[PDB]
Write an enzyme that holds these catalytic residues in place. Structure first.
Site, PDB file in Angstrom:
ATOM      1  N   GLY B  10     103.576  26.620  47.052  1.00 30.20           N
ATOM      2  CA  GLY B  10     102.534  25.736  46.499  1.00 30.20           C
ATOM      3  C   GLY B  10     101.887  26.307  45.360  1.00 30.20           C
ATOM      4  O   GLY B  10     101.990  27.564  45.223  1.00 30.20           O
ATOM      5  N   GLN B  15      99.193  31.121  42.478  1.00 28.56           N
ATOM      6  CA  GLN B  15      98.089  31.639  41.630  1.00 28.56           C
ATOM      7  C   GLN B  15      97.153  32.570  42.298  1.00 28.56           C
ATOM      8  O   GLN B  15      96.761  33.545  41.679  1.00 28.56           O
ATOM      9  CB  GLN B  15      97.331  30.489  40.938  1.00 28.56           C
ATOM     10  CG  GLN B  15      98.178  29.779  39.953  1.00 28.56           C
ATOM     11  CD  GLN B  15      97.417  28.541  39.459  1.00 28.56           C
ATOM     12  OE1 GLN B  15      96.209  28.360  39.717  1.00 28.56           O
ATOM     13  NE2 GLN B  15      98.083  27.689  38.612  1.00 28.56           N
ATOM     14  N   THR B 179      85.751  13.667  50.065  1.00 30.03           N
ATOM     15  CA  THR B 179      85.402  12.289  49.737  1.00 30.03           C
ATOM     16  C   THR B 179      86.416  11.313  50.174  1.00 30.03           C
ATOM     17  O   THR B 179      86.183  10.078  50.261  1.00 30.03           O
ATOM     18  CB  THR B 179      85.148  12.150  48.242  1.00 30.03           C
ATOM     19  OG1 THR B 179      84.371  11.001  47.904  1.00 30.03           O
ATOM     20  CG2 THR B 179      86.309  12.098  47.339  1.00 30.03           C
ATOM     21  N   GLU B 254      97.808  44.331  66.308  1.00 34.63           N
ATOM     22  CA  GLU B 254      96.544  44.797  66.814  1.00 34.63           C
ATOM     23  C   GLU B 254      95.400  43.847  66.476  1.00 34.63           C
ATOM     24  O   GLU B 254      94.508  43.568  67.347  1.00 34.63           O
ATOM     25  CB  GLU B 254      96.194  46.229  66.250  1.00 34.63           C
ATOM     26  CG  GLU B 254      97.184  47.238  66.697  1.00 34.63           C
ATOM     27  CD  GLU B 254      97.021  47.503  68.163  1.00 34.63           C
ATOM     28  OE1 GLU B 254      98.016  47.525  68.886  1.00 34.63           O
ATOM     29  OE2 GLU B 254      95.897  47.769  68.617  1.00 34.63           O
TER      30      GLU B 254
END
EC number: 3.6.5.-
Lengths: 164, 439, 427
Positions: B10, B15, B179, B254
């Site tokens: 992706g 990035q 939204t 761990e």
């Protein structure tokens, strides 16, 4: 009296047809009253769920086409003559070896059950519901056919004995 | 020992991965090709000639991560400047996009086409799982490849190679906060797949960092490139502290077994302390109490379960940088003895912590800079019924007014699957509610 | 690469493709002479959007240069940007601008479509990088309407699998009364929506409004109004092929344009400008951009959809800005509009942004809005009919060209269902 046998046989053909016939009427009405988005819903898919494929091949093979191919079967619902073919369907013309092959491929099949298909797609729902009712109606119409033809022989004898 | 293989899928995950690579490269002083002039400097790994010499080495340099991307811009960026010998051209991967925000799209539509070539690299990456430990997968979870391709890969990782730990770093807003009313619809199935097939997920809220980036950090122009740069600093502050130097250097196994003590994955929200405007313009070194307090600043702690509530199982603070032992024990003891915060009544203990002792040596340039004292935080709340309950609520808030499952099935998926997964989230609500009132 | 072929139909449909040519070419580094002028990244890759490379770096059209008649062809070739390459890429034959819809569908269309369709047939299967077809269409005479509806139908029957975009140059949709048009036009529209996938509609007289007010010009030249649209068009097509994490392609654009799919009309409007083509200040910032998106008087198509329900907005930006500022300014203007986009979905705007600015512009953007609540248009074509549907002295002209009465009956049915649909979508 003469009408006694004719009446019996006639009621006999109708008792068989009435079990399946409100389903056929409900089912044609299902297909007519779809919104145009639910043809795009069943059509759009690149890779269909397998029950969708089985219901779209079922109706296509019943209705008029020899195509098993996902690319060719999905567009048939966007023909301008789809509802003309279904309104002017002849369930009698469908040949007997072929009927029993259709019930073998689709009717008997595990993933063609009405609950498993509407779970997969309610937009397949209307289309599977016609495919079931019709293919069952050709089967019951052909099954009452030997007594339906004996009726139309008796009716012909019954008119001719009346004109004697 | 050292770190271990990293998978970048992706555009955010590449990035973030480039930001993290620059952090390792920058402290190291690595030359773009060569041949390197130091005896020897630590940075990725504890050799630096022939460059990268990242535990993997030789030929035309064998890389220690995989980047997969839509545009040649990043391969051009590495081929022309620095990092050029630190990767191999055939495992610097570049393709195309055709895009959909739909689960069925990554699961089927592009998912059956691009699978066999990337599979063959996954199969080889599982053969050469350098560092031994497990898979670090950088997601890519909210979109159509994020929802679709990840759900197919997560199972395929898990069924074939489930003995390996799978670490997933995820960027994704807590439900209903977005939204978008139609955003839960593709995510409902992946949310369901996670139930079976994700033991370990560290989550960042992109909405929470956006608000921090604009207001705490006081950035005038936020963009994606600058946000992903900031979430690379998170990934680095965690990882680059535990690689092999002055630290506890806690293993993957761990940590996983401390995170997940009972059935179903224990995913915490991640936060980060020095995402503050004073720090960006350079200010005091700070004591372990003060770095705490910077981290417990408004907006930096979550408001999700209400700030002091939600019945914490634990919070785990990861103290990077030079540390004093008195200062650290009081740093986690003070909040508890104040007792503003709410914990489960069966377990008010909160002994969960990471104490490490290497400073960041990075040069001034980015939003990270050379320091003595750092922290990162993982927050675990029991009363998470609120997340499930929002997912349940928000799907129906479209749905009841008007049906909108059509497109997610038009791309090739079953209809009932969507709402059954929704029904699951609704039953999950009451399971995480009861543990949220504890006993 | 994209390699897009642009089909151009009817006199304004070509005129707008002409005016595009000369802007897109300059932009992407191709000379009037067909030679190089670039040395910028899109004046190197991106550039195969409409072009191909040959001959010591001279550029061959993938979107070939075509018209019907020789002197109009001569204008395309004189250019400035039609002078590019060697004669196999200039095509012509026949003519158009005929008359009578029923004649244009049947007798005159039969001859025209054969010469035109055979061009495309060779071209279509010879472009293996084709990421799509661009169609600039107008309504000129019987050829741009009735011939044209056959054309779209005939072309979409040949290529149902190939991606199509129809931009339609339309004289302002049904203003003032008509004679025997209303059956003919709802038959055209009934053929439009079964033969059309993706429909953008440009209104002449909204152009005239923006010319007299925003541009402050009192002669409203339509070549100039097409040259402004082309500049904006350029702005769209080039932007989605730059870097930028909010940019998007094929199925993500598609689902957004029709979230409930039965074909709907898509409406252009304007972003930053207080002027274009005149005046020193012509505007560039985040409130200036949004201001016109939350007005009502810039948008195409005389049918007023915004009073009924505002419906989904696609916005496409080019220029340096704060991603976060635009989202704070968008939270502002979306709660001036509230849940008045549709009941079902609060907030209904999605954006696509790039950092790299346009030619001599510092920042610009477009608005593309969406058809809801437009029964007023479909009632207005029925209402303008009545006086002449009673008096009826001129539909014999039409039926005597091969047109059956029942296709007109069905068409009025379809107009009535379209009234329905818009009314349903308003509720």
């Amino acid at each position: 009296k003469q009408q006694e046998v004719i009446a019996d046989k006639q009621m006999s053909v109708k008792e068989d047809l009435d079990k399946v016939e409100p389903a056929v009427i409900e089912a044609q009405n299902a297909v007519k009253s779809i919104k145009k988005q639910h043809l795009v819903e069943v059509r759009s898919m690149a890779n269909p769920p397998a029950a969708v494929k089985l219901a779209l091949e079922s109706i296509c093979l019943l209705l008029g086409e020899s195509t098993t191919d996902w690319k060719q079967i999905r567009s048939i619902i966007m023909r301008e003559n789809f509802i003309p073919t279904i309104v002017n369907f002849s369930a009698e013309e469908i040949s007997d070896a072929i009927r029993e092959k259709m019930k073998k491929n689709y009717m008997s099949n595990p993933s063609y059950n009405y609950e498993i298909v509407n779970r997969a797609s309610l937009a397949c729902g209307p289309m599977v519901k016609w495919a079931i009712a019709q293919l069952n109606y050709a089967d019951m119409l052909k099954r009452v056919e030997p007594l339906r033809n004996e009726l139309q022989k008796l009716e012909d004898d019954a008119k001719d004995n009346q004109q004697k | 020992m050292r770190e271990c293989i990293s998978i970048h899928v992706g555009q955010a995950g590449v990035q973030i991965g480039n930001a993290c690579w620059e952090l390792y490269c920058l402290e190291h002083g690595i030359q773009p090709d060569g041949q390197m002039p130091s005896d020897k400097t630590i940075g990725g790994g504890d050799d630096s000639f022939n460059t990268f010499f990242s535990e993997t080495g030789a030929g035309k340099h064998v890389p220690r991560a995989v980047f997969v991307d839509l545009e040649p811009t990043v391969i051009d960026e590495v081929r022309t400047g620095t990092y050029r010998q630190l990767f191999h051209p055939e495992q610097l991967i570049t393709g195309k996009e055709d895009a959909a925000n739909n689960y069925a799209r990554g699961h089927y539509t592009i998912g059956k086409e691009i699978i066999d070539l990337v599979l063959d690299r996954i199969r080889k990456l599982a053969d050469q799982c350098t560092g031994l430990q497990g898979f670090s997968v950088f997601h890519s979870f909210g979109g159509g490849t994020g929802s679709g391709f990840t759900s197919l890969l997560m199972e395929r990782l898990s069924v074939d190679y489930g003995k390996k730990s799978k670490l997933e770093f995820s960027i994704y807003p807590a439900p209903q906060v977005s939204t978008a009313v139609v955003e839960p619809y593709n995510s409902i199935l992946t949310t369901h797949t996670t139930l079976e097939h994700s033991d370990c997920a560290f989550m960042v809220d992109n909405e929470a960092i956006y608000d921090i980036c604009r207001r705490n950090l006081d950035i005038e122009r936020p963009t994606y490139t600058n946000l992903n740069r900031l979430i690379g600093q998170i990934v680095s502050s965690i990882t680059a502290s535990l690689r092999f130097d002055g630290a506890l250097n806690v293993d993957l196994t761990e940590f996983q077994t401390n995170l997940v003590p009972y059935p179903r994955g224990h995913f915490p929200l991640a936060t980060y302390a020095p995402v503050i405007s004073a720090e960006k313009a350079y200010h005091e070194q700070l004591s372990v109490a003060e770095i705490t307090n910077a981290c417990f600043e408004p907006a930096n702690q979550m408001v999700k379960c209400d700030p002091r509530h939600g019945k914490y199982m634990a919070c785990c603070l990861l103290y990077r940088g030079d540390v004093v032992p008195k200062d650290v024990n009081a740093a986690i003891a003070t909040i508890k003895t104040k007792r503003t915060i709410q914990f489960v009544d069966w377990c008010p203990t909160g002994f969960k912590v990471g104490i490490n002792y290497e400073p960041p040596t990075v040069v001034p340039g980015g939003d990270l800079a050379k320091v003595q004292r750092a922290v990162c935080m993982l927050s675990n709340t029991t009363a998470i019924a609120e997340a499930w309950a929002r997912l349940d609520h928000k799907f129906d808030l479209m749905y009841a007014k008007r049906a909108f499952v059509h497109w997610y099935v038009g791309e090739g998926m079953e209809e009932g699957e969507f709402s059954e997964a929704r029904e699951d989230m609704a039953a999950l609500e009451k399971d995480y509610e009861e543990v949220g009132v504890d006993s | 690469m994209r390699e897009i072929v642009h089909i151009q139909a009817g006199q304004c449909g070509n005129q707008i493709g002409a005016k595009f040519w000369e802007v897109i070419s300059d932009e992407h580094g191709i000379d009037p002479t067909g030679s190089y002028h670039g040395d910028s990244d899109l004046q190197l890759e991106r550039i195969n959007v409409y072009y191909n490379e040959a001959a010591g770096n001279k550029y061959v059209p993938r979107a070939i240069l075509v018209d019907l008649e020789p002197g109009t062809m001569d204008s395309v070739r004189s250019g400035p940007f039609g002078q590019i390459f060697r004669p196999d890429n200039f095509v012509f034959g026949q003519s158009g601008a005929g008359n009578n819809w029923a004649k244009g569908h049947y007798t005159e269309g039969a001859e025209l479509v054969d010469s035109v369709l055979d061009v495309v047939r060779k071209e279509s299967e010879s472009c293996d990088c084709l990421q799509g077809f661009q169609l600039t269409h107008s309504l000129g005479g019987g050829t741009g309407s009735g011939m044209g509806t056959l054309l779209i139908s005939k072309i979409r029957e040949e290529y149902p699998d190939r991606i199509m975009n129809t931009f339609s140059v339309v004289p302002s949709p049904k203003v003032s009364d008509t004679v025997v048009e209303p059956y003919n036009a709802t038959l055209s529209v009934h053929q439009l929506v079964e033969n059309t996938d993706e429909t953008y509609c440009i209104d002449n007289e909204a152009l005239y409004d923006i010319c007299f007010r925003t541009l402050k010009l009192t002669t409203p030249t339509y070549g100039d109004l097409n040259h402004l649209v082309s500049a904006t068009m350029s702005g769209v097509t080039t932007c989605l092929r730059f870097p930028g994490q909010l940019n998007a392609d094929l199925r993500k654009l598609a689902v957004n344009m029709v979230p409930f799919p039965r074909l709907h009309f898509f409406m252009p409007g304007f972003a930053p400008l207080t002027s274009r083509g005149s005046q020193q200040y012509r505007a560039l910032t985040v409130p200036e951009l949004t201001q016109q998106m939350f007005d009502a008087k810039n948008m195409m198509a005389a049918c007023d959809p915004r009073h009924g329900r505002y419906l989904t907005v696609a916005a496409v930006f080019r220029g340096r800005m704060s991603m976060k500022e635009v989202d704070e300014q968008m939270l502002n203007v979306q709660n001036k509009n509230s849940s008045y986009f549709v009941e079902w979905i609060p907030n209904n705007v999605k954006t696509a942004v790039c950092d790299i600015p346009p030619r001599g512009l510092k920042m610009s953007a477009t608005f593309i809005g969406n058809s809801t609540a437009i029964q007023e248009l479909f009632k207005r074509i029925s209402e303008q009919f009545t006086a002449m549907f009673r008096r009826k002295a001129f539909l014999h002209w039409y039926t005597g060209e091969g047109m059956d009465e029942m296709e007109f009956t069905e068409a009025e049915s379809n107009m009535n269902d379209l009234v329905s649909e818009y009314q349903q979508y308003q509720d």
